[PDB]
């Protein structure tokens, strides 16, 4: 004997837990992998939030100090979400994403019995190899025009009330309040109608949007648009959500297929109009 390596061998690469010192690299991987033409700071702030939500959730793949690939797992009580998968285009299609995902699953299986995600066209085939099954599509729409229609009765609140925690638990099927909180530390606005619905507005995005009726969801969405919301990701199985957004003359941006490994989570998707993020569920 001679050389002593205390990790599995995988193509001469190093895969390890990310820390906040790795934010710039994560951002670079993401912008490469997703061909993101937007401003950098946008991604940096999003990833700072992700590491607050799950400090030990991010795996990074390195080929000799060059950052090549990443992915994340976010834990709730009954399920975890895998999101933010990305391998730099020069390094794609040689098994790196598959390996990062394997490792994430390994971590997830010890803690929870259901793992879910929102799959793009490139990812879909990877996740299917691990026996992920289709749930329903989650469709990203851009809201183009302001409806000529006033609303009254929607307020922004600085602390999450218990009734919001309860209606979100019902919509999502789990506890993700720490995610809402992390976004609100960065300026995200919590809009509430009556005690029957809420929406979270962060940058140009509303998510989640949860409402006991289409009329309450509409009130929130109109006020969100006024506060700069231009995008919403709708679960395609909420029949009222697609009809709701039509008054904004929406433009479809992209869709994913939500997928699951393990047992179905009881969720109330009829009240669930806008998912939080493809990364988080």
Q: Judged by CB under 6 A, does residue 120 bind ligand COA?
A: yes
Helix, strand, or coil (residue 17): strand
Q: Does 123 bind ligand COA (CB under 6 A)?
A: yes
Identify the residue among 16, 40, 94, 239 touching ligand COA (CB under 6 A): 94
Q: Which residues contact 101 (CB under 8 A, 6 or more apart)?
A: 71, 82, 85, 126, 127, 130
Smallest separation (angstroms) from ligand COA to the CB of 172? 20
In sequence order, which residues have a C-beta less than 8 Å from that of residue 162 and are 6 or more positions away? Answer: none
**Known binder of ligand: residue 93?**
yes
Residues 214-253, one symbol each (x = binds ligand COA by CB under 6 A, - = not), give ----------------------------------------
Residue 120 marked as a ligand binder: yes
Site track for ligand COA across 29-48, x = CB under 6 A = ----xx--------------
Give yes or no for a contact between 218 and 244, defined as CB atoms under 8 angstroms apart: yes
How near is the Cβ of 97 to ligand COA at its closest, in Å? 3
The verdict on whether omega for the bond into residue 208 sits within 30 degrees of 0, i.e. cis, is yes
Question: Is residue 98 marked as binding?
Answer: yes
- In this structure, the number of other CB atoms found within 10 A of the CB of residue 169 comes to 17
Cβ neighbours for 174, distance < 8 A, ≥ 6 positions apart: 76, 77, 78, 79, 265
Binder to ligand COA among 28, 122, 195, 226 (CB under 6 A)?
Answer: 122
Query: Which of 88, 90, 96, 92 has its CA nearest to residue 28?
Result: 88
Please report which helix (H) or strand (E) contains residue 136, including its range.
strand 133-142
- Quick one: which segment of 119-127, 153-161, 196-204, 213-221 binds ligand COA (CB under 6 A)? 119-127
126 binds ligand COA (CB under 6 A): yes
Q: Is 277 in the site for ligand COA (CB under 6 A)?
A: no
194 CB neighbour count, 10 Å cutoff: 16
Q: How far is residue 29's CA from residue 85's CA, in Å, rounded to a whole number?
A: 9
Q: What share of the chain is helix, strand, coil (3-state, %, to 5)?
A: 35, 30, 30
Q: Which is nearer to ligand COA, 181 or 236 (CB)?
A: 236
Interacting residue with ligand COA among 92, 114, 195, 226 (CB under 6 A): 92
Q: Does 275 bind ligand COA (CB under 6 A)?
A: no
Contact 260, 115 (CB under 8 A): yes
Q: To the nearest whole angstrom, how small is the minimum distance from the Cβ of residue 82 to ligand COA?
A: 9
CB of 123 to ligand COA, least distance (A): 3
Ligand-binding site membership of 254 (annotated) = no
Told to check if 87 binds ligand COA by CB under 6 A, we report yes
203 with 187: CB under 8 angstroms?
no
> Which is nearer to ligand COA, 60 or 245 (by Cβ)?
60
| 62 scored as a contact of ligand COA (CB under 6 A) | no
Residue ranges binding ligand COA (CB under 6 A): 33-34, 85-87, 92-98, 119-120, 122-123, 125-126
Residues flagged as binding site for CoA: 87, 93, 95, 97-98, 120, 129
């Amino acid at each position: 004997h001679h050389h002593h390596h205390e990790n599995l061998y995988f193509q001469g690469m190093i895969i390890r837990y990310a820390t906040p010192d790795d934010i710039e690299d994560m951002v670079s991987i993401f912008i490469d992998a997703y061909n993101f033409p937007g401003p950098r700071e946008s991604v940096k702030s999003s990833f700072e939030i992700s590491l607050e939500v799950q400090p030990d959730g991010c795996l990074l793949a390195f080929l000799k100090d060059e950052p090549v690939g990443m992915g994340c797992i976010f834990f709730y009580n009954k399920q975890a979400w895998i999101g933010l998968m990305g391998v730099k285009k020069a390094y794609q299609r040689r098994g790196i994403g598959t390996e990062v995902f394997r490792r994430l699953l390994e971590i997830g299986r010890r803690k929870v019995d259901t793992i879910r995600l929102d799959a793009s066209s490139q990812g879909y085939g990877l996740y299917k190899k691990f026996k992920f099954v289709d749930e329903y599509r989650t469709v990203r729409y851009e809201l183009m025009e302001r409806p000529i229609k006033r609303v009254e009765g929607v307020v922004e609140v600085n602390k999450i009330p218990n009734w919001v925690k309860e209606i979100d638990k019902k919509a999502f099927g789990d506890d993700r309040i720490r995610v809402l909180e992390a976004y609100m530390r960065r300026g995200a606005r919590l809009l509430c109608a009556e005690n029957e619905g809420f929406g979270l507005v962060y940058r140009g995005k509303i998510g989640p949007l949860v409402a006991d009726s289409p009329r309450v969801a509409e009130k929130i969405l109109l006020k969100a648009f006024q506060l700069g919301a231009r995008e919403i990701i709708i679960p395609e199985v909420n029949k009222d959500a697609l009809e709701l957004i039509k008054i904004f003359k929406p433009s479809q941006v992209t869709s994913c297929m939500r997928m699951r490994l393990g047992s179905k989570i009881e969720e109330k998707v009829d009240i669930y109009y806008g998912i939080l993020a493809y990364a988080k569920g």
